């Protein structure tokens, strides 16, 4: 259920091609994305292709150099990376988008690509003691959070992200009651009630920016439990 491939070592100005074999769902029905993550840094959205293959969006950082694509027949999504730079070094994940709410419910394991500020304002770290209530607030513009539904994703150390809250406050089929989402115009807050030890993870808030026509991802918040 989403396996990346084609990762390797490349030199600057080089060229590389990723692929993402789907399994268990009707690939052709859902839109697909590529979201990279640097070495120890946050999440950055790369590109998105509709199942229609008709509506493509590239991040202003890879605009022109990268080429998204798919083959709904072979059940695999691809990404042609040309004119590569050292700053393109990351882990690339391919995330299944939902037609309805635009959230990324299924993410792949990742593939590392080695080569030889932000709109969303999120506190870098959060400190909480067992059993307390912890709020992580993410601050966007009138063009993103203001105008579109927010999705929070939890990244557990080592593991790829997992949709925590979507459509501003909806808990998916798994996420416990202690987690609650909300939005107040241009700001969005995730509230963990009854802090547990297991809740030690990285939290990201993400909205679509109609002005940038790209997803904006939060600056992450590392929640440490005491």
Answer whether 126's CB lies under 8 Å from 136's CB: yes
**Would you say residue 180 lies in a domain?**
yes
Residue where one domain finishes, among candidates 85, 117, 149: 117
Residue 27 belongs to what domain range? 1-117
Q: Indicate if 157 and 189 belong to the same structural domain.
A: yes
Q: Indicate if 138 and 113 belong to the same structural domain.
A: no
Q: What are phi and psi of 27, to 5 degrees?
A: -35, -55
Answer whether 46's CB lies under 8 Å from 62's CB: yes
Residue where one domain finishes, among candidates 117, 140, 173: 117
**Would you say residue 225 lies in a domain?**
no
Place of tokens 């439990």: 225
Q: Indicate if 163 and 205 belong to the same structural domain.
A: yes
Experimental method: X-ray
Query: CA-CA distance, 177 to 159, in Å (whole number)?
Result: 22
Q: What does the chain look like in DSSP terms, one character per residue?
A: --EEE---EE-TT-EEEEEEE--SS-GGGS-EEEEEE-SSS-EEEEEEE-TTS--EEE-TTTTTTEEEEEETTTTEEEEEEES--GGG-EEEE--EEPTTT--EEE----EEEEE---SSB--SEEEE-TT--EEEEEE--TTTTTTS--EEEEE-TTSPEEEEEBTTTBPPTT--TTEE--EETTEEEEEESS--STT-EEEEEEEEETTTTEEEE---EEEEE-
Q: Indicate if 3 and 98 belong to the same structural domain.
A: yes
Q: Indicate if 49 and 101 belong to the same structural domain.
A: yes
The resolution in angstroms reads 2.6
Q: Indicate if 109 and 48 belong to the same structural domain.
A: yes
Residue where one domain finishes, among candidates 62, 85, 117: 117
Q: Indicate if 33 and 107 belong to the same structural domain.
A: yes
Residue 10 has a CB neighbour count (10 Å cut-off) of: 17
Query: CA-CA distance, 225 to 126, in Å (whole number)?
Result: 9
Q: Indicate if 75 and 169 belong to the same structural domain.
A: no
Answer whether 144's CB lies under 8 Å from 199's CB: no
In the beta sheet, which residues pair with residue 218? none
Closest CA to 190 of 218, 226, 215: 218
Tokens representing 120 are 């969303």
CA-CA-CA-CA torsion for 83, 28, 76, 207, nearest 10 degrees?
A: 50
Query: CA-CA distance, 87 to 12, in Å (whole number)?
Result: 10
Structurally, the chain folds into a number of domains equal to 2
Answer whether 104's CB lies under 8 Å from 33's CB: yes
Tokens representing 224 are 């440490």
**Would you say residue 226 lies in a domain?**
no
């Amino acid at each position: 259920t989403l396996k990346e491939s084609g990762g390797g070592l490349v030199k600057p100005g080089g060229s590389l091609r990723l692929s993402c074999a789907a399994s268990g769902f009707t690939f052709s029905s859902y839109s697909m994305n590529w979201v990279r993550q640097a070495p120890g840094k946050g999440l950055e959205w790369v590109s998105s292709i509709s199942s229609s293959s008709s509506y493509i969006y590239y991040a202003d950082s890879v605009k022109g150099r990268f080429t998204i694509s798919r083959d709904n027949a072979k059940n695999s999504l691809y990404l042609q990376m040309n004119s590569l730079r050292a700053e393109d070094t990351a882990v690339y994940y391919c995330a299944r988008q939902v037609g309805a709410t635009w959230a990324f419910d299924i993410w792949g394991q990742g593939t590392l690509v080695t080569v030889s500020q932000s709109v969303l304002t999120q506190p870098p770290s959060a400190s909480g003691t067992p059993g307390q209530r912890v709020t992580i607030s993410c601050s966007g513009s009138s063009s993103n959070i203001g105008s579109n539904t927010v999705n929070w994703y939890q990244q557990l150390p080592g593991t790829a992200p997992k949709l925590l809250i979507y459509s501003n406050n909806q808990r998916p089929s798994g996420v416990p009651d202690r987690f609650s989402g909300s939005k107040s115009g241009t700001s969005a807050s995730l509230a963990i009630s009854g802090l547990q030890s297991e809740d030690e993870a990285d939290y990201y808030c993400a909205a679509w920016d109609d002005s940038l026509n790209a997803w904006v991802f939060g600056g992450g918040t590392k929640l440490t439990v005491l």
